[PDB]
Design a protein around this ligand. Sequence first.
Ligand SMILES: [Cl-]
Ligand SMILES: [Cl-]
Length: 162
Amino acid sequence: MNIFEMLRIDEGLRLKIYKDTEGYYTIGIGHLLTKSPSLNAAKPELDKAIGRNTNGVITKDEAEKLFNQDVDAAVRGILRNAKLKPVYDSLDAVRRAALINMVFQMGETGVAGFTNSLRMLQQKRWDEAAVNLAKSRWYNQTPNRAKRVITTFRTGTWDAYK
Ligand SMILES: [Cl-]
Ligand SMILES: [Cl-]
């Protein structure tokens, strides 16, 4: 198991514009297109992302290409973030994947916002960090995915995904 297979299980794959759990226009492997309500504001963002007139549908290859970019950008965002970087550096390889997953879903700003949990992770207080991460809108809105991520932070193994 690796970050790619982990996010592929959490986000699924859809070749046609769809709405995410929050109601936003998305395509492929969790690639957010726009927070705007218009499918007309979404279609152009999609064409611009792919480099072609797509008419709202893309191929598997195109989806995977957006995915590689999005994972690369998540990592690079963590490393440029003054609050995230020190946490990431402190972690083992499995748990680093868990932080990348959070960043991919909620963005760097959001994650950097979990001040207390981040401090607990850095101190390696696993059980306490898992309890604090659960007290969030994130966990209440997407409980099954959140529990998988949380379990990965608590245990440091890929069990929740096996
Ligand atoms: Cl893009
Ligand atoms: Cl869920």
